[PDB]
Amino acid sequence: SKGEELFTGVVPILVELDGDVNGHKFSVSGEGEGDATYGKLTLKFICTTGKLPVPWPTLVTTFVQCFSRYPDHMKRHDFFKSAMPEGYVQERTIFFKDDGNYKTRAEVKFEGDTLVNRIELKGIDFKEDGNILGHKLEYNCNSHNVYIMADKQKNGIKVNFKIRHNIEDGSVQLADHYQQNTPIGDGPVLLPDNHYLSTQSALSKDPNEKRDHMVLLEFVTAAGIT
């Protein structure tokens, strides 16, 4: 795989998002690096427009699966790296149970030696006093399985998973994710057999940062094929 070679070392990452949730407009810029050899991501995000109008955890999945660690025996199933450097379009609808939904369109590609994730996010039908606009979600992330299947129809993949956000009262806010990825370039890509990615994420704060922000440490490994 041509794209695979671009990830053998540490790669700088830039994330830029413009969002509008129930008319609340905001922007976020993130910076960090990824080391796919260890399925590792380290990033810091800053809301550049002021206060983030939704809870930071709800944006984690939106903020580069090309950094997932694919075991050597599963290398032929790594769609994400195969689309590089030209990149891929990643689209999602995220349904927050008993609340609104986010629709996102992103382009993930290299700009020079930097992997960039540019995203537009639109959220509608949120409840003013719900868990999202009401900021009732804990500042943490549970671990999940991300299910991947080929989508020959579009020379891409279809992805689905259920994120469970912890609510401060002890309950859980489900966020059902439906995702599609298609290559931007014309080069061939790897269409995978069914498998999944196992994720884990840790959120923290920079003690010296006064802007609204999020520090993220994440590990992701592909699995499901012997």
Overview of this protein structure:
The protein has 226 residues and is an all-beta fold. 2% of the residues lie in helices and 50% in strands. An 11-stranded mixed β-barrel has the order 1-2-3-11-10-7-8-9-4-5-6. Strand 1 and strand 2 form a beta hairpin.
**Strand percent estimate:** over 45%
Q: Largest beta sheet: what is the strand line-up? A: 1-2-3-11-10-7-8-9-4-5-6
N-to-C series of helices and strands: EEEHEEEEEEEE
Q: What is the makeup of the main sheet?
A: 11 strands, mixed, barrel
Give me the count of strands: 11
**Per the principal axes of the C-alpha atoms, what is the gross shape?**
globular
Radius of gyration: 17 Å
Q: What's the tally of helices? A: 1
Distance between the termini: 20 Å
> Helix/strand-derived class?
mainly beta
The assigned CATH architecture is Beta Barrel
What portion of residues is helical? Answer: under 10%
CATH topology: Green Fluorescent Protein
CATH H-tier superfamily = Green fluorescent protein
Total number of distinct structural domains: 1
The first-level CATH class is given as Mainly Beta
PDB class: luminescent protein
Keywords: green fluorescent protein, GFP, fluorophore, chromophore, luminescent protein
Assembly: monomeric
Entry title: S65T Q80R Y145C Green Fluorescent Protein (GFP) pH 8.5
Put the structure in a nutshell:
The protein has one domain: Beta Barrel (Green Fluorescent Protein). The chain is 2% helix and 50% strand. The chain contains one helix and eleven strands.
